[PDB]
Protein backbone atom coordinates (compact mmCIF):
# COMPACT_ATOMS: atom_id res chain seq x y z
CA UNK A 1 0.00 0.00 0.00
CA UNK A 2 1.08 3.70 0.28
CA UNK A 3 2.33 5.10 3.60
CA UNK A 4 -0.83 7.12 3.98
CA UNK A 5 -3.10 4.10 3.41
CA UNK A 6 -1.31 2.23 6.19
CA UNK A 7 -1.37 5.31 8.39
CA UNK A 8 -5.11 5.77 7.88
CA UNK A 9 -5.74 2.23 9.22
CA UNK A 10 -3.79 3.19 12.29
CA UNK A 11 -5.68 6.49 12.64
CA UNK A 12 -9.05 4.80 12.30
CA UNK B 1 -10.97 11.59 25.48
CA UNK B 2 -7.61 13.49 26.13
CA UNK B 3 -3.81 13.20 26.49
CA UNK B 4 -0.95 15.51 27.48
CA UNK B 5 2.25 15.19 25.52
CA UNK B 6 5.50 15.60 27.24
CA UNK B 7 7.65 18.52 26.12
CA UNK B 8 9.61 16.89 23.33
CA UNK B 9 6.63 15.18 21.74
CA UNK B 10 4.75 18.44 22.05
CA UNK B 11 7.52 20.19 20.20
CA UNK B 12 7.30 17.61 17.39
CA UNK B 13 3.49 18.11 17.08
CA UNK B 14 3.75 21.93 17.20
CA UNK B 15 6.31 21.73 14.40
CA UNK B 16 3.52 20.55 12.06
CA UNK B 17 0.85 23.00 13.13
CA UNK B 18 -0.56 21.74 16.45
CA UNK B 19 -1.83 24.51 18.66
CA UNK B 20 -2.78 22.80 21.96
CA UNK B 21 -1.32 21.26 25.15
CA UNK B 22 -3.72 18.36 25.14
CA UNK B 23 -5.13 16.20 22.34
CA UNK B 24 -7.16 13.20 21.48
CA UNK B 25 -5.02 10.24 20.41
CA UNK B 26 -6.44 10.55 16.92
CA UNK B 27 -5.15 14.19 16.76
CA UNK B 28 -1.79 12.95 18.05
CA UNK B 29 -1.67 10.33 15.22
CA UNK B 30 -2.79 13.04 12.80
CA UNK B 31 0.09 15.40 13.59
CA UNK B 32 2.55 12.53 13.86
CA UNK B 33 1.46 11.48 10.34
CA UNK B 34 2.12 15.06 9.04
CA UNK B 35 5.54 14.86 10.64
CA UNK B 36 6.49 11.49 9.07
CA UNK B 37 5.33 12.67 5.65
CA UNK B 38 7.01 16.08 5.78
CA UNK B 39 10.30 14.46 6.81
CA UNK B 40 9.84 11.49 4.40
CA UNK B 41 10.79 8.98 7.06
CA UNK B 42 8.96 6.01 5.52
CA UNK B 43 10.63 3.53 3.12
CA UNK B 44 9.77 4.35 -0.51
CA UNK B 45 9.40 0.61 -1.45
CA UNK B 46 7.83 -0.76 1.75
CA UNK B 47 5.80 2.20 2.84
CA UNK B 48 4.64 0.70 6.09
CA UNK B 49 8.17 0.88 7.50
CA UNK B 50 9.18 4.13 9.20
CA UNK B 51 12.92 4.83 9.65
CA UNK B 52 13.42 7.14 12.57
CA UNK B 53 17.10 6.68 13.35
CA UNK B 54 18.79 9.95 13.70
CA UNK B 55 15.50 11.82 14.03
CA UNK B 56 13.73 13.35 17.02
CA UNK B 57 11.00 10.70 16.45
CA UNK B 58 13.49 7.92 17.10
CA UNK B 59 14.70 9.53 20.28
CA UNK B 60 11.04 9.65 21.44
CA UNK B 61 10.00 6.18 20.41
CA UNK B 62 13.33 4.56 21.40
CA UNK B 63 13.53 2.51 18.17
CA UNK B 64 15.41 3.03 14.87
CA UNK B 65 12.35 1.86 12.92
CA UNK B 66 8.85 0.50 13.23
CA UNK B 67 5.94 -0.77 11.13
CA UNK B 68 2.78 1.26 10.67
CA UNK B 69 0.86 -2.02 10.86
CA UNK B 70 1.83 -2.43 14.55
CA UNK B 71 -0.93 -0.24 15.91
CA UNK B 72 -0.76 -1.34 19.56
CA UNK B 73 3.03 -0.97 19.66
CA UNK B 74 2.79 2.55 18.22
CA UNK B 75 0.41 3.43 21.05
CA UNK B 76 3.00 2.05 23.51
CA UNK B 77 5.67 4.26 22.03
CA UNK B 78 3.49 7.32 22.15
CA UNK B 79 2.36 6.62 25.73
CA UNK B 80 6.04 6.80 26.85
CA UNK B 81 5.72 10.43 25.79
CA UNK B 82 2.51 11.26 27.62
CA UNK B 83 2.37 12.97 30.98
C1 LIG C 1 -2.65 8.78 3.52
C2 LIG C 1 -2.73 9.38 4.90
N3 LIG C 1 -4.12 9.75 5.42
N4 LIG C 1 -5.25 9.07 5.15
N5 LIG C 1 -6.15 9.52 5.85
C6 LIG C 1 -5.74 10.59 6.57
C7 LIG C 1 -4.40 10.74 6.31
C8 LIG C 1 -3.46 11.67 6.72
C9 LIG C 1 -2.81 12.42 5.69
C10 LIG C 1 -1.80 13.39 5.88
C11 LIG C 1 -1.45 13.65 7.20
C12 LIG C 1 -2.12 12.94 8.24
C13 LIG C 1 -3.12 11.98 8.03
C14 LIG C 1 -3.76 11.37 9.10
N15 LIG C 1 -3.14 10.90 10.20
N16 LIG C 1 -3.91 10.42 11.04
N17 LIG C 1 -5.17 10.54 10.58
C18 LIG C 1 -6.33 10.16 11.35
C19 LIG C 1 -6.02 8.97 12.37
C20 LIG C 1 -5.11 11.21 9.35
C21 LIG C 1 -6.27 11.61 8.65
C22 LIG C 1 -7.16 12.40 9.40
C23 LIG C 1 -8.40 12.91 8.86
C24 LIG C 1 -8.66 12.57 7.52
C25 LIG C 1 -7.76 11.79 6.78
C26 LIG C 1 -6.56 11.32 7.33
Task: Give phi and psi for B52, each to the nearest 5.
Answer: -125, 10
List of E strands, chain B: 2-3, 23-24, 49-51, 65-67
Tally of domains in chain B: 1
CATH number of the domain residue B51 falls in: 1.10.245.10
Resolution in angstrom units? 1.9
Containing structural domain, residue B41 = 1-83
Degrees, nearest 5: CA angle B7-A5-B4: 20
Q: How far apart are the first and last CA of chain A?
A: 16
Experimentally, the structure was elucidated by X-ray
Determine the 3-state secondary structure of B25 from DSSP.
Answer: helix
Q: Whose CA is nearest to atom 22 of ligand 1?
A: B30
Compute the distance from residue B30 Cα to the ligand 1 centre, in Å.
Answer: 6
Q: What is the DSSP letter of B55?
A: S
Task: Give phi and psi for B50, each to the nearest 5.
Answer: -105, 125
What is the rounded CA–CA span in Å between residue B11 and residue B14?
5
Q: What is the DSSP letter of B12?
A: H
Q: Is residue B32 a contact partner of residue B41, using CB atoms and an 8 Å limit? A: no
Residues with Cβ < 8 Å from B47, sequence gap 6 or more?
Answer: A1, A2, A3, A6, B68
Amino acid sequence: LTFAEYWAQLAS
Amino acid sequence: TLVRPKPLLLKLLKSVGAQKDTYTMKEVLFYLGQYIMTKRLYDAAQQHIVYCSNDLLGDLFGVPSFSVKEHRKIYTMIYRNLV
